[PDB]
């Protein structure tokens, strides 16, 4: 029985980056070649593995994380990166092995008027640890004055929205991203490729 990659890439709904998703894939056969050979991804790099070897490999688990960011934020998904998305929304670790896959969703996630359902976290008292996920809505105290939470004031709401319009530059267009994470523990493997 084949793996549910289609459930991950073709999901009609994809999360907001601050509330990114994670599906655990196990006990199936993965023909990764359906992914790396696809001309439709705008971005496709594996780290610590050469994409050739994926179909000849066997992992204990595979973890698909999925979200939507804007075009010029995609350079931040990769490990060792900093900036808004890496510091406050989604952070890969430095020892990361796995692939980062992206593709422009402007036809899917843009609406005439702007699609505001996609949000990102603008402020945080400290950086995320790798793979931490933060869905707080507490009011950020950027300033020395204590905030009573109820009000904005000089304190700020933490989540800001992407204004996703079709006519935006390619930098400010939605990009669905999937991050595969390959875990090899000293347990019998459960996700292999067709050649393995």
């Amino acid at each position: 029985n084949l793996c549910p990659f289609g459930e991950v890439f073709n999901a009609t709904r994809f999360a907001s980056v601050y509330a990114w998703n994670r599906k655990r894939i196990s006990n199936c056969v993965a023909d990764y070649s359906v992914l790396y050979n696809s001309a439709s991804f705008s971005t496709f790099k594996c780290y610590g593995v050469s994409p050739t070897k994926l179909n000849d490999l066997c992992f204990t688990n595979v973890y698909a994380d999925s979200f939507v960011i804007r075009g010029d934020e995609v350079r931040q998904i990769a490990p060792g990166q900093t900036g808004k998305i890496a510091d406050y929304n989604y952070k890969l670790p430095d020892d990361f092995t796995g692939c980062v896959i992206a593709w422009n969703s402007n036809n899917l996630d843009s609406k005439v008027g702007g699609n505001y359902n996609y949000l990102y976290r603008l402020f945080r008292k400290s950086n995320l640890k790798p793979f931490e996920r933060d869905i707080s809505t507490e009011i950020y105290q950027a300033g020395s004055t204590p905030c009573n939470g109820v009000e904005g004031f000089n304190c700020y709401f933490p989540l800001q929205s992407y204004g996703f319009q079709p006519t935006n530059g390619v930098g400010y267009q939605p990009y669905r991203v999937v991050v595969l994470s390959f875990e090899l523990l000293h347990a019998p493997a459960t996700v292999c490729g067709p050649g393995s």
Partner: antibody, heavy 124, light 113 residues
Framework: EVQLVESGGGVVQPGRSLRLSCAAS????????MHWVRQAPGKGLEWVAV????????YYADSVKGRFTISRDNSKNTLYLQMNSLRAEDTAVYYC?????????????????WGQGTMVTVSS | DVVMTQSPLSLPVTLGQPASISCRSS???????????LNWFQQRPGQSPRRLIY???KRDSGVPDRFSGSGSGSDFTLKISRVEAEDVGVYYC?????????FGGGTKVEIKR
């Protein structure tokens, strides 16, 4: 039977250092992460540190960040807590609790087993 | 940090009668894989804590099935169905995915008299 047996606590003058040991048995120490949790007399539980199954990562509570240093020895099945520049607010009972099996990148439920604690009293 | 707020610390109970403790988090607790990594610990007098419930509602091995976890989002609940006298002490809740990894303040359970 799984066992976690801390030692090394006692009376430490402020500003000085103390090193605590947690000797694990009954399970493959190498396979799980580990945690140090402290309880001050009469108060609730406060998480101190975390180490990864393989030692790769160490995360600290900001109250001890910069002063405490977690470390394990997978050959001798022993977790360690190195406490430096001890303040009075650090007076507590220190527990080790088992972490998750595997990488704390992906497996999160933990604190399934706890040691008996070792008492650390910082006074002059 | 994620603030864990427990039920009132004094929770005097009648033996043989159900009791229940409320844990409430400052943010919603579901993680990216859709699990909620909230634990329930019991600390008897002069003892180190024991885990009763992991993942909101899953009972740890050797825990009597009167103990029950439930809840979702920001509001959680440990429930005992028939309090016995062994159940005396302090009960802490805990979140497992936010890095501060804070715990509840604790709820003390005493016999009602």
């Amino acid at each position: 039977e799984v066992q976690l047996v801390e030692s090394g606590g006692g009376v430490v003058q402020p500003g000085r250092s103390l090193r605590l040991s947690c000797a694990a048995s009954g399970f493959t120490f190498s396979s799980y992460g580990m945690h140090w949790v402290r309880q001050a007399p009469g108060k609730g539980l406060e998480w101190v540190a975390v180490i990864w199954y393989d030692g790769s990562n160490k995360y600290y509570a900001d109250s001890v960040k910069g002063r405490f240093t977690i470390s394990r020895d997978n050959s001798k099945n022993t977790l360690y807590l190195q406490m430096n520049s001890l303040r009075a607010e650090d007076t507590a009972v220190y527990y080790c609790a088992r972490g998750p099996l595997g990488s704390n990148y992906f497996n999160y439920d933990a604190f399934d087993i706890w040691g008996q604690g070792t008492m650390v009293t910082v006074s002059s | 940090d994620v603030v864990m707020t427990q039920s009132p610390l004094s929770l005097p109970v009648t033996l043989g009668q159900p009791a229940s403790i409320s844990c409430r988090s400052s943010q919603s607790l579901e993680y990216s894989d859709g699990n909620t990594y909230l634990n329930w610990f019991q600390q008897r007098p002069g003892q180190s804590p024991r885990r009763l419930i992991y993942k909101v509602s899953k009972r740890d091995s050797g825990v009597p099935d009167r103990f029950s976890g439930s809840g979702s989002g920001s509001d959680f609940t440990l429930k005992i169905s028939r309090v016995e006298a062994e159940d005396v002490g302090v009960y802490y809740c805990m979140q497992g995915t936010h890095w501060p990894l804070t715990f509840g303040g604790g709820t003390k359970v005493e016999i009602k008299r």
